[PDB]
Symmetry: D2
Subunit: 391 residues, 4 copies
């Protein structure tokens, strides 16, 4: 039923108004026909009645309903991009004197938000290994307000044991807010809220949009946390434009047919790479032997198309250039989750610098691939030609 | 030359590409043709070279150039709405232990951001009377990091003596960042940076857009402050979508013909109201006798169309309804700065609650009007019929 | 009740705005019927503003249509992908093989070319008339004249028709003719075509109504007589415009008064200054005495827009033309006009003689067409003035 | 080189993307010339992908056009505001008074109506042929036959043409005929019309190419023979589409393979289950044996999309029709199809007989047309199954 849910999510008649898709209602001012009307809207301004564009229009409410049904939440808070949803969801719950506990595999800007913004506001952050599981109790302080997960991890793709972490956190700091950047799973391949996580955050920019042309962050919250996140994010003026909400809603419609192709293609490339003479290791959550694969197999209902592998060699600059500058199909760029395939390289030194309190365990150049919707054999061909350029 | 500047602002060929208007480049991923290319973009990622959608596309850079030329700045930082530009421009400059000094006439959500978000981050806020001028030294602490102005003030429309406040602030706390919400002036009727203000902030939502259908905040910064605001806002993931940037750029083109009509019409209504038997006072910066009018006349090059007046009576609920529910032309709604005319009422109690460390000096119902582009005599007719409903 | 109030409010009923200030943007091809009964009711009202199929329009189209009928005083508005589409398709909707089309020889070139290249091969003939022919138009009417096509002011050369005299003459000989006008210069509002007994007022909404040179759309506002046939026959050619464009056009109306007053004030000031300039032979601005049909402009129009032309005393050679046109700081070379920015275009008399069928030109120097936008008028005059310095 | 790779990359050259993954959206009517020389060069290349005027298109149009020529193997793509506009205007671009149009009687109703209501009054006649006539089409050719109009599978009833036999027969008698096809069902890609010797492949891009039921656009991909005349004559009717829509259509291509594979797999599964259902008399799915022209589908197509129909054993009365159609949970009633969602439409044999000129229908029960979208196929079968329960 996921495919059916996706097609229908948020498409109530009060939002579509005769069309198939939600209307696009562009507004700041929302007009009250009367003082009574204005009073009614005012009491329901956080409850899907038209009140002010900053709180949203029909189009925003449609997307919010859809995200709440897809991720099993009480509310969905919207932001101009994923990095805004992370920074602002964390800010919404902290105060001076708090502690933040974040996976050391967190997306780099999520780490930087912590080390550069929070630290000057009297909030401390420390970090843990993604495979720590129930041993995360070691790192929990009496002032731990936030435990921030990302499964699979950015770049190196380690999958957490979420149930073990959650049980540990609840037993030691029940007041903590547990958050996850669940972008890799597009929110639907790993039902974070069903595991006792409080807030599931996405760079909706990625798979939800699906086309590399609109930026939006979402935070689906359980009932415990929705009001605080919603009201504090509002005080920060966080919102997303109506047209971007429309396009994200529209992305959901093909999310299933897309994710199934990204899964099938990326796993095939990964299986091929793992057997390649020029390849040291492959980090793909779906691949047997990858870090946390057991958790992926147990806790997820699918895979997306982002993963990485480690070359046997550490490429020098000339080799790096010969490798990356000559691809026919893979493009160099940041972000992922679109229809096209992307490639990026990270040297182990670069990764060592964004693994706080951790230790890197590879020495070759790491290549991150996003496998899009091109023919998978064309993409294999392209990688095979790349391996020839560096033998 | 303002009219000419507005027509041409940010319309360089590298942005328009053969068209009259800037292109609309929707993107998250921006592609690097080579490793060298990627290195060059990386060093120039805050300097108008394509790097990542979060930093912006051609369309964002075009708007940023235009805002910088119109307000005489080193840089323009973009946000999803005005409330986001205020909250995030202030956050960008504070740390735990700082003090914020804000006019007590500041837009309510700007005050709330302070009292509800900053206070829990160990930052204190206090407030001053808008007409305080050089006497603001009274309120300056050795830890005052931000002095936040809004001229004219929200709702009651008091105009600051900006030169006197700035001189006082500089002489006592030279390290302070002086900020203004300059939305009423659309940034161009009061050249805030030329007065020694560090950051000029707009709800671009208002006059810059001009049509009540796109939300966007801007912060034009001098060279002293641009980097910090830009980089810290980025760490908060602040941005605006490409299409909204396009539409804001497009708004500028008619900004002059619009503002001239809002000035001419609103002043005529104000002159009429000031002579009306049912009216106690009129708060219009352009009107002789209004609070700070002398400063407006000296420091501004024009007026917009937002102002307020005070009824001789304090309307009861039945009267409020009879008055507001029966207008033909004025609509009830929040925001302003569009092509249409709006009306809102505030009771003195409501205003008393958002004037921290101040004292209200009126007792009748306050009516805030936004005078749009309708025929001014039609709008007078509509108000005259409204006065008949409450005699 | 004044035009500015009309412009702000046109089309903005709550059934289209749904709480917002502007109409909603309803993007759709499929429109869903909740029941057989609902489907049957929508079928009955499919050309009557009930959601039935995207090709017939959505709420966003209905809003614009309502606003256009209000502004031009029409019974209906038919929408098209651009001005040229509204012209070609409004003519096509009323003709049959064996009909005759009578068109002003000052008509926009593609409108003439549609007649001469498309209609001719469908057994429909066209002839042309001088825009100042007035009551003597009777001389050009045939038994089979189906359409009389006006454009006032004319394209490029700006001649104003004596519309009352023309309309009275046509009605006296072929009362059942379809009289159409390309009313783009006036933006449908500075000249109220339907009050003058014209059947169809056509605009490239691309120009003034949109106002920003970034969307294309044609409109045809019809009296009650002609609406059904134009609408149904335009529908059979699949003519429509996208919902977003309809939104932007409605949004354009909002500032149309403040923009046109500026275009009027500025262009008139530039035209007066050009009239006094030694390098200028003649100025073709409808608002200016000595301009063809000025007298009809004064009587029949309530304003001027920003488009006009003037004739140089010299006929520039290619080198002087480049010198002149290549070195402007504020005027740009471009087609279209009706936007916020100022534009310049040169035409040699030989070029204009070639698109004046069955008529003669009245000038021999280089003709410059100006669009005066919203820039400072003195900056614009300084730019023009430096141009003259380049060709003395 | 496979279709999926093609789809992801079609039209995405750097001169159109400018650093982004997708083409830029260039909204424009005016396109600015920096000099007389630049203006002269743009004039020369105005139908050749150089920015000249918005009506000819911007970078966003050129990108789509390139992608369409690549996908359908054409020399050019002409763009139109909707499918119906691409049909009416592609036919109009090639005819003259005294020509004859020969069209399949299974052609989309508005395509027939254009012929019978518009072309007839311009001295152009039309006749119709059974979609299975194959090589016997020679029998319907006239000395003056200018156009032969195919649609395969046919609208509603889904009959597949034996295109090779038809094309060979037409070429043997009137080699200079213009053969056109409405190729919307195949999305231009499951049947490569131009490899079959057809001159013009027309789509309502509104359907599969856009894929989401929220933009309207027509395309006509032309061989080298026919491109200029279709393009220039379509230009004279002011035919274009807005830049944003062109963007969205190009963006639609990106997911067209993953969507069509799903539509194929799901619709085939539903069609097989319907074939076995007791309340079902016949299933018209091209992919299914016993369906008219299935044999030509198997030989000539590389896939199926999600649109098909089936015929009930009963002819439903009005009460049963309401009962059936009014109570679906996942299927919606709507026109158009080719989107992500599932749709249902009923037609009575009397309705279809009325739009089958010069031919007979082959069924007598109620005909149901299904669009199978991206929902779970078993959920869809449960919805259909509950429907049958409502009319047993
Ligand atoms: C898991 C996850 N979570 C949030 C975001 C941010 O979303 P947004 O890009 O929509 O703000 C992302 C964005 N990801 N982009 C990429 O992984 C590739 N880009 C980067 O790594 C990048 C780009 C620009 C600047 C800096 C970095 N970086 O890693 O430091 C994410 O991967
Ligand atoms: C001077 C100034 N500065 C910033 C903003 C906010 O910009 P944004 O609306 O684009 O976020 C505004 C927005 N103004 N809106 C209005 O004055 C009318 N609305 C309100 O007062 C309002 C609306 C909704 C909720 C609360 C309030 N309020 O005053 O508390 C502003 O006036
Ligand atoms: C009075 C009038 N009426 C209709 C139209 C057409 O509008 P559209 O551009 O929205 O189709 C216009 C168009 N105005 N455009 C120009 O002056 C510039 N462009 C051209 O003239 C042009 C452009 C493309 C192809 C052919 C020509 N031409 O003049 O032959 C008009 O001036
Ligand atoms: C094979 C084929 N070819 C062209 C078009 C037209 O596309 P457009 O809707 O983009 O013009 C279509 C249109 N498909 N639309 C439908 O099945 C639903 N709508 C209608 O049939 C309809 C709609 C409006 C007016 C008239 C009709 N009609 O069938 O007569 C098509 O099926």
């Amino acid at each position: 039923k996921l495919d059916t849910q996706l097609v229908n999510a948020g498409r109530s008649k009060k939002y579509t108004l005769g069309a198939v898709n939600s209307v696009i209602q562009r507004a700041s001012s929302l007009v009250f026909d009367s003082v009574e009307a204005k009073k009614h809207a005012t009491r329901n301004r956080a409850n899907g009645e038209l009140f002010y564009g900053r709180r949203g229009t029909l189009t925003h409410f449609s997307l919010q309903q859809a995200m709440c049904e897809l991720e099993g939440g009480a509310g969905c808070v919207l932001f101009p991009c994923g990095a805004a949803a992370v920074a602002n969801s964390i800010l919404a719950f902290i105060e001076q004197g708090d502690h933040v506990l974040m996976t050391n595999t967190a997306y780099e800007p999520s780490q930087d938000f912590c080390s550069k913004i929070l630290s000057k506001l009297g909030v401390t952050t420390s970090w843990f290994d993604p495979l720590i599981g129930a041993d995360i109790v070691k790192h929990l302080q009496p002032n731990t307000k936030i435990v921030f997960l990302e499964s699979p991890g950015s770049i190196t793709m380690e999958v957490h044991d979420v149930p073990a972490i959650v049980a540990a956190v609840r037993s030691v700091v029940p007041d903590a807010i547990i958050m996850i950047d669940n972008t890799w799973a597009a929110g639907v391949l790993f039902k974070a809220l069903d595991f006792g996580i409080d807030v599931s955050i996405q760079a909706a920019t990625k798979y939800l949009v699906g086309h590399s042309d609109a930026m939006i962050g979402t935070a689906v919250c359980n009932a415990r946390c929705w009001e605080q996140l919603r009201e504090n994010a509002y005080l920060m003026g966080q919102m997303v434009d109506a047209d971007t909400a429309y396009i994200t809603s529209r992305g959901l419609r093909t999310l299933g047919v897309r994710l199934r192709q990204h899964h099938e293609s990326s796993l095939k490339v990964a299986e091929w790479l793992a057997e390649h003479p020029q390849v040291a290791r492959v980090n793909h959550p779906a691949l047997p032997g990858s870090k946390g694969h057991e958790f992926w197999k147990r806790d997820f209902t699918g895979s997306s198309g982002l993963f990485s592998f480690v070359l046997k060699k550490k490429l020098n600059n000339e080799e790096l250039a010969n490798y990356l500058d000559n691809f026919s199909l893979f493009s160099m760029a940041y972000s992922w989750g679109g229809y096209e395939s992307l490639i990026l390289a990270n040297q182990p030194e670069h990764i060592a610098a964004i693994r706080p309190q951790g230790e890197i365990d590879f020495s070759g150049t790491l290549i991150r691939l996003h496998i899009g919707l091109e023919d998978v054999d064309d993409l294999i061909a392209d990688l095979d030609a790349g391996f020839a350029r560096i033998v």
